[PDB]
Structure formats: structure tokens, C-alpha cells
């Protein structure tokens, strides 16, 4: 015991499950199927009205995301951005690209213990709900972060 | 203490993965055996990155690694 | 202590800690032997118990054992055990300075093909040996609760070590049988590929024979002569394809 | 190679009293030599303030060798030769026997003398006449040594006398 | 080959007192030697504090052989060389004899002396005159030691002294 | 007395060694990102040799003995084969042990004895720290020298003043008997040990902008 | 005791097993020859009767 | 090369009483010879005013050589030869035993003598008769000297006697 670590450093399964429950009841979607994990966040609670900029209060949420991401031993990370149809295709794709870039940059700045990070956006080309009444409040406008836990 | 705390509870260990399995189908953070993927960045011992401590006995404080280099740091010096 | 070792030595300057050491000096002299006894007994008991458990578990799966390592499904037409072949890929050796030797593939004959009487069985290989030891002999026994506790924990350590040793032995045996079976199947595949020469067997026959007291009706003698071997000539080698 | 008069540790198992010489065997428990056994005997000092063991025949198993390193035992954590035994075993017995024999002598003679200045005379009889033989036998036996006895579960420290290879 | 200073077990069946030397035999019942037997004799220490046995003549079956390995015996369940016997054999006998002789002397002399200040005289007679010869004979016989006797069904353990091929 | 000095020195040396080792481990990526060796490693997995340069050489031997030259170049170690490129741990990561055996031989009873014990502990601690720093400096100097020699060899070969090694490979088909076989035998040898040319006619210079 | 070996050793840490074997070694060394004698006499008698 | 009769310091780790000579060991901690040990014995003086240690057999590591430079010990930081221990061990015991035995003799005899001019008679009995044997045994054992004993936790100073290399 005083010669080898009994567990991954700073890892607590009780903490993991508790924060998972807290995030899910907060409203950010979290799914763990098999050895692959996916997390979804609505656009409005993170960005401005179709604007590549960050609301200040969202930094606490980003900190919580980083705290959750610290625990797992991860190799590759993927972040994708999606939005609604506003002006064109190019404009929306550029907006998603910028959002992915900024979120990836901040995550890498934070202590993410991964080796590879991929970032991309796809505008409004992959709708997930027929109900598109609202604008940025629509669920389809979102950001996804996915990976597979290894060993 | 409780590897599967706030979970279903400890079932057994997969030796091939070298990891324990809780009742809920999630790998616990703990370990089973040395034959598992740890992360090692610091370690003890002297005459490292060399032939190791030469098994011969030197009456003086000098200790020499098997490659022939002498490490005063492992040795004791007046 | 040695963490803030300056402060540690400053504290140790007072002689009450030397007084405290005066009593615990005994353990370094006397108590340092009970650990060996505890380790030995724990190792023995754990090894034996693990061996019994693994033997029972192995017996639990009798059918699959032969079902997979059916050697009898690999015997040749004259009750011949096929030889064993080993293959290496991307061979490279550094002999010394200015000396590199490389090759892509290489092959070695490990066990030459010989005759057989009955096909082998896994029980020859993977049957862990078990004899129950029932002679716990102890010379020195703990007299204080502290040394009793350290005896218990060291006994647990020995138990763990015995379990690990048994697992290691099983691993070695299973590796050995894997090696043998892989060699035989590789020989079959290579002989199909036409890189080795199939073994050759001749025979001789004698009719009725013997004196007026000892007789045999027919006396036949079978001797193999061409031990299988690689064919260095290459142009006749045949490859394969799939779909 | 054993240093000139170095310190090793062993364990003793078979015990005996300091009365009758006999073979006693122990086993080294640590150090370079492992599993080694040692046979010897004991010695008796004039003063019972210490007790030590003569250990000479050292046999190390594995190879058929029997070196002749003679060694003793030093009491653990005392760094002294005092032995785990008692020394007051046979003082009170002889003291009481002698004093009682004398008292019998005195009682008989004095109560005979004080007659001038039946059962009383019988007490005189018994004490006066049985005091004398008891007193002389007590003087005969008064020199019995207070023996000591080693214990059967104590380890030992060993200081060597000669060098080996 | 027998290890230098090892322990085996045997069984004792022939009982005898520690009074006269005689052949005492045991039979090895464990270890490599099976069916082998061992003849020897006993000894007497200065006191009755123990009793040990010397075994010298070992006879092994199989071949016509007779080895002469000398070893001693240690009591099972005792870890001591003492023998299961009794040591209070002849204490009270001589004690009472001597004390009674003295008492006779005293009674005769004192009740003869106290006459100035028939059956009484006869008691004086008997006690006084039979005190002396009895007392001196008791003093002569007082030196008889207390013996011990081995039992006829007690096992034994034996540590070895010299090896055999 | 001197026991306090000894124990203070040992403890301070060990403590400083642990501190410096953890500090070194704190920065990993920068370290090897700096001291890459594969980039220098040539095409045949051969470690380039080591060159040393000195300038303005003047030597006096005795009364009336003066020798003077501009520059001197020395070949330190010849090029040799190598499977995996080296690293920096063996050059900088010093060994470490945990001295855990302070014996109670000389123990302070007088208050002045305790005071001098404290001061001797302090000075031994400082001395051990200094020794550890010297050891680190030695390691850094050695590794820097080796790397600089590598760089100098690269620059000289670029300036075309040394002969790049010439390597011959002999290729053979299948080999061995009908029991042991090697499909495609190949032998790699290096013969032309790199060395500096002695004729300046072939020397070519360069000019920045 | 020796079956659940860990528990058996935890128990044998105490001297109750020592005091138990103290008396039992007496019988274990005492009764040995009786077995062989009974075996011999039974073998002889049974062989004769069966014959 | 060592001066003729120079000074050195050593650390003493083991103790013993001045009752039984035996092997003893100390450790030189300073000077050119580092890690060296020294074994020897002690002496018994007629007067208890000092106690010294004989140290000759020097075991120095480096080479398996055993020089036998003989040397003694002095009181650390005192520059004196006396031993830091106790010397009043067995004065009072023998004094009291002797005086009490004499008092018993005197009490019995004098209280019997003054009878002319039963419990008091019994006191006379006991004192007069048990005083004599106690007195003679006490005079027999009165010659016991008071011992001295070193301690196992004090350093020592060693003066050289002969030169070595």
C-alpha cells in the first residue's frame, strides 16, 4: 500500500456519481452507454444570441465540467457544435466552428488529461427535433462533448 | 476504503483489465494487481539508469553501479 | 522525523525520545524474526488452498478442455505426432558496433516428429498438483497483542503471495500448452502451403516365422525415414488468396 | 567472512536448570547465516548474578560443514550478561530450618534449666533432644546453591569469538 | 546420513528404578529408521532434580549391523530432560525415625532427672535406653538418597550427538 | 559532535535531492522538446559523432617554447550504431535514497550541547544542499557538452569539412538447413568512420544576409 | 482449523491450541505401537479363519 | 602510523558487572580509523575506587585484518580513570546481618543470665540459640566485596600503548 497507488490519483467513484446526478438534475444531458460517454449542453445557457461570445456566469459551469472531466482516464476527446438556421449555411457553420474553437481552447487551458482533442461544427445540418418553433432556445442548437473511456 | 462506494458494491476483479467491477456495471477507480496500467512518474532507489547497485561489498562508503560509474549521492562521504 | 528534518533533529535533541527508544529497541532485536514464520505459514496455506480451488474449477470445465485441445483430430495417417514449428517476424540483431543482421521472417523446428501410442491430453499439462499439508508447526508464538496483529497481517501477506505464485504457475503451464498447439497447427498450415516435406514411412513384411516352439503368423515392421524438414528451394512454393 | 567478534541474533527453544550439564540447541534467525543450528552446554558461576551458555558446535545445513565457532548469549535490550532466571530459590528454606532447629535446642534446654527457679517437661524433652540432630544436619546441608533455570522461549544475542569464511 | 543434532522419537516399554545399572531398550517408531531398537543405561545426578538416560547401542534390522550411536532422551510434552518419577521417596521416613529416637532420649533423660524435685520409671527406662542406639543407627542410615524409577509405557524424544553414514 | 554534522549533511542532501527531482519532473515536455536526439540521428539509425572546438590556442612549455594557433577541432567519440535514441533522465535525474537510520550514539544532555548540536545540524544541512547543487551543475554541464558536440558535428558536416560515414549492406536470400530458415538475410556494416578532411581546397564557406 | 486457514491461524495465535496439543501429544506418542500390534494379530486371525 | 601514546575517542554500547570476565566490544567513531571496533575484557580490582577495561583485539574494516593494539578507557570529559557507577552495593546488608545475629546471641544469653536477679523465656530461647548459627554464617559470608558495573550508554576515551599501521 505505501509502495503502490491503490487507485487513480484524485479519483472517487462516489464523487463521480454524485456530480453526474447533480449535472443531470441541473439540466445538462449526460449519457454513459458502454464505455463511451457523451455530454450535451444547450446553446442558450452558454452563449449569447447567435454570438460567438461567452456569458460570464458560464465560467462556473465550465469549471464544473472540468472537475467532472478530471476523474476519468481519457485519450481522445471530440467537441461538436450545432445551431439553427439563421442567415445562410456558411454563417452558421462558421459560428459553430468558432464556438468549438473557444470551448476547446478553454478546456485545454484547464487541466484536461487527454492526448488528442478534436473540434468541429456543423451549423444546423443535423436536426434532432421537429419542433423548431423557438430560435436559440431550441434544443437542436447545442454543443456535444464525447469520448470513449479506455481501460 | 470503499472502492464501490455509493454504488451497488464490489463484485470481483477482472484480472485481464486489472480492475474491479461494481454491481453497477462501472469500473471502480481501485486496482487489483501490478499487472495493470498505472502511471509512474517518480520512484525511489539509487544507481538508477545504470547497471544498478553492484552486489559486491565495499568497506568504504563508496557504492558503484554495475556500469562502473560511482554515485557519491548513494554513497556516504565525510 | 526527517520531513522537516532540521526540526525533527531539534526535537530529538531532548532525551525523552531516547527514553522512548529504550523500550522499542527490543523489537528490532527480538521481534524481527516472527515475520518470517508468519510469511512462511501464510505462503504455504494460501498456495495449498488456491491450488485446491483452481483444481476444482478446472475440473468443472472438463468438456471444453478436450473439446478444444483434441489432439486426436491432428494425428497423421500412421499415428504420427506432427512436429512443432516456431515463426518469428521482423528479425533484427545488433551483434556489436558496425554489425546489424536483419530478416523478415524466420522459422525453427522445435520438437521433431516422433511416433505416438495414445494422443496426449491437457491433464498432463494443466493439472495443478495438490497435496493437503496438515502440519502447522510453530516455534515462537506471539505474547503481546501488537505482535499478534503483525503476525496476522504478515500471514495475510503470505496468503496473497501464495495466491500470486499459484496464478503464475498456471499462467506458465497455459503458455506452454498454447505453444505446443500453435506449433502443431502451424506445421499443418505450412505443410499445406508446401514449404516443408511431409514425413515418409516405409515398411517390410515377413510371413510365418519362428521355430517349432515360438511362432508368429505375420511380422510387419514400420520405420519412418524422412523426418519433415523445410525446402530451401523456393520457386515451387505456393501462395494463397481469399475473398 | 565473519567480522572479528561481531553481533548476530538467534532463538533458543529448549530449556534446562543450572544443575545438570547436557546438550542444548538453538537456531540463528537472521544475518548472513540462515537456518543454522548450534549445540553446546552451560557454565555455573560462583555468584548467581549472571548466567551464560557455552555454544560451540555450529552446523549450517545445506552443505555438510561444521565450523567450530564458540559463542555465548547476551541478554536482549540489556547489553549485559544477566540471564532470565531467579536467584533467591533456596535461602528461606535453609534459614528457617536452621533457626527452628536452634529454637528447639534452646527451648528444651532453657525450660529444663528454669525448673528450679509434666507436659512442660515433655515439651522440654522433645525440643531439647530433636533440636540437636536437626541443627547438625542443617549445618551439613546449609551450602546448597540457589540454582537458576533458563527459559524455553527466549531469543538471544550472540557475540562471535573467531572468524570464518 | 543423520543430520548433526536432529530429533527423532521412540517408545520406552521396559521400566526400572534408578538403583542398579541395567540394559534399557527403546524402539524408534518414526522417521527413516523404522523397526530399529536401541539399548543403553542410565545415570544418577547429584540431586533428584532430574533423571536422564544414555543410549549407545543401536541395532537396525534389514542387514546384520550393529551401530554405536550415542544419544540422550528428552521428555515429550516437557521439553526437559527430567524423568516422570517421584522424588519424595525417603524424606519423612528418616525424618520421623531420627526425631522419634531423639524424643525417646529426651523423655528418658528428663523424666529421670526430674525425679528428685513404677510405670513412670519404666517409661523413663524404655525411652532413655532405646533412644541412643536407634539414634545412632538412624544417623548412619540418614544418608540414603531418594531414587527415581522410569515408567513402562512412556514415549521419548531423542536428540543426536554424532552422525552416521 | 561530528555526528551532528554527518546527519545534518546526509538529511539536507537527501531533502534537496528530492526537491530537485520533483522540480525536474514538473517540466517534462519542454525538456525533451529541447533535447531531442532523433532529429540529429541520421538515416541509418546511426548516432552522429561528437566534435569539440577551441579557439585562440596558445601553449607555453618552458623557457623558449611557445606554440600558437587559431582553432583546434577534436573528435571525441566515433559514431556507432544505436537502436533507440537516448534521453535526459540518465544525464540529469540523480539517484535518491531515504536515510532513515539516525543512531543515538552521542545525545545532547547539556543545554550548550543541544545548542551546538542545533548549529552543527544547520551547517551540515547547508553543506549538503550545496553539494547537491554542485552535483546538478555537473550533470547539466556534461549533457550540454554532449549536445553541443552533436550540434558542432552537424554544422561541420553541413559546411562540408567532414566525411559522412559510408555504409554497405549485403543482401542474401533464404538461408539455413531444412530445420532453421531465414527468409531474407541482410547484413549492415559501416566502414568509413567519419573524420575531418585535411585539405582546405574542398572547403566551402557561407555568408548570411 | 487448517481448512479455513486464515481463521485457523487467527485462532491459533492464542495459546489455547497450545494447551490443547500439550495433552494430545502424550497420547499421539503413546498409542502408536498398539495400531501395528492390532493390525498384525487381526491379519493373522482373519487369514486363518478365512482359510 | 599512529603516535606513541596518543588520544582517541570511542563509543561504548554494551555494559557488564565486574563479576564475570567476558568478551566486550566498543566502536571507534572518530579519527582516521572510521567504523572500527575493538574487543577485549576487563579487570577486577581489590579496591572499589576505580574500574577499567582491557581492549586489545582491534577489528578494522577495509581489510580483514585484526591488529591487537591494547588500550584502556578513561572517564569522558573528566580526564580521570574512575568508573561512573555505584560502589555501596553490599556494605549495609552484611553489616546488618552480622549485627542482628550478634544482638540475638546477646539477647538470649543475657536475659537467661539475669533470670535470678514463659514468653520471655521463649524469647531467651530463640535469641540465644539461633544467634550463634546466624553469626557464624554471617561471618563466613561477610567477606563479600561491593561490585562495580559499567553502563551501556556512555562514550569513552582511549589512550594508545603501541604504534600500528
Q: How would you describe this structure in keywords?
A:
part of a larger assembly, 8 chains, C: 243 residues, alpha+beta, two-stranded antiparallel ribbon, 8 strands, 45% helix, D: 165 residues, 6-stranded antiparallel sheet, 2 helices, 6 strands, 27% helix, translocase, Dot/Icm, Secretion, T4SS, Inner membrane lipoprotein YiaD
Explained architecture:
Chain A: Residues 34-151 form the OmpA-like domain. This is part of a larger assembly, with one copy of chain A (151 residues), one copy of chain B (78 residues), three copies of chain C and three copies of chain D (165 residues). Chain A is an alpha+beta fold and 151 residues long. Chain A is built from three helices and seven strands. In chain A, the strands form two sheets. Chain A has a five-stranded mixed sheet. In chain A, strands 3-4 form a two-stranded antiparallel ribbon. In chain A, helix 3 links the parallel strand 5 (76-82) and strand 6 (116-121). With 78 residues, chain B is mostly loops. In chain B, strands 1-2 form a two-stranded antiparallel ribbon. The N and C termini of chain B lie far apart (46 Å). Chain C is α+β, with helices and mostly antiparallel strands. Helix content of chain C is 45%, strand content 19%. Chain C has helices at residues 5-12, 16-29, 34-60, 62-68, 123-126, 145-193; strands at residues 80-81, 85-96, 99-109, 114-115, 200-206, 209-210, 215-216, 219-226. Chain C is elongated. Chain D is rod-shaped, with a radius of gyration of 26 Å. Chain D starts with 6 loop residues before the first strand and ends in a 6-residue tail after the last strand. Chain D has 165 residues and is of the alpha+beta class.
As a whole number of angstroms, the C-alpha radius of gyration of chain A is 17 Å
Strand tally of chain D is 6
How do the strands of the widest beta sheet of chain D line up side by side?
5-4-3-2-1-6
N-to-C span of chain D: 4 Å
The largest sheet of chain A is: 5 strands, mixed
Helix tally of chain D equals 2
Number of strands of chain A: 7
What's the multimeric state?
part of a larger assembly
Largest interface here, residues on each chain? C-F, 33 and 42 residues
Q: What structural class should be given to the helix and strand makeup of chain A?
A: alpha+beta
- Give the percentage of residues in beta strands of chain A: 25-35%
- Determine the strand fraction of chain D and express it as a percent band: 15-25%
Based on CA inertia axes, which overall geometry of chain D fits?
A: rod-shaped
Largest sheet of chain D: 6 strands, antiparallel
Count of DSSP helices of chain A? 3
Order of helices and strands of chain A: HEEEEHEHEE
SSE string of chain D, helices as H and strands as E: EEEEEHHE
Estimated structural class of chain D: alpha+beta
- Widest β-sheet, arrangement of strands of chain A: 1-2-7-5-6
